[PDB]
């Protein structure tokens, strides 16, 4: 199992949690995740505000790396590992985000390598999309789509990321 592997790199920073994931297998033969890709991944649910990663945020992680996973091998063709525009934003609708054409291109364009997306930066982009949207609920006080943001806790909640 990977709570073994977890306890066994052990809270983990970025580092042990690189090391940990990539030990799991969840990434198949697709590269190991990055540090930075890591990084964020504790970023998002970093509730309690340490830079680490807890055992039951792990297991929330765990069950969303497994969802994000699913919808990449349902987007990706033969499954290479990469996927491109199409399919990312293929993924982006599957995960209930309705977004615009011009805002998607920007996602895309954002996470691409020579137009094509790796596992790594497809998770990225997950994780990014995940924790935004995260901090704009908690302003949109009357969940209508829009919200108001002071300058500085417009910087704190989006430079936490």
């Known amino acids: 199992s990977v709570y073994t592997y977890f306890s ?3 809270e983990v920073d970025a580092e042990e949690l690189q090391r940990c994931l990539t030990q ?10 990055s540090l930075e890709t890591c990084r964020i991944m504790i970023a998002m649910l970093d509730r309690d505000h ?3 990663m807890g055992f039951n945020a792990f297991k929330e992680l765990w069950a969303a790396l497994n969802a ?3 919808n990449f091998m349902t ?3 033969d499954g290479s590992g990469t996927v491109e525009h199409h399919e990312l934003r293929q993924a982006i609708g599957l995960m209930g985000y309705r977004l615009s054409p011009q ?19 497809y998770v990225a982009c997950c994780v990014k999309l995940r924790a935004l949207t995260d901090f704009f609920r908690k302003r949109d006080h009357l969940q209508q789509g829009s ?8 910087l704190q909640g989006t430079m936490a990321i």
């Not at 799991?24 to 995740?33: A, E, L, M, R, V």
């Not at 805002?103 to 930066?121: C, E």
């Not at 919200?147 to 417009?154: C, K, S, V």
Request: glycine letters at 8%.
């Open 147 to 154: 919200a108001n943001f002071i300058y500085d806790d417009f």
């Open 24 to 33: 799991s297998g969840i990434n198949g033969t697709y590269s190991p995740f």
């Open 50 to 52: 340490t830079g680490k």
């Open 68 to 70: 994000w996973k699913e």
């Open 8 to 10: 066994a790199v052990a």
């Open 103 to 121: 805002t998607l291109t920007t996602i895309v364009k954002r996470y691409s390598k020579n137009g094509r997306i790796f596992f790594d930066d």
């Open 75 to 77: 987007v990706d063709q």
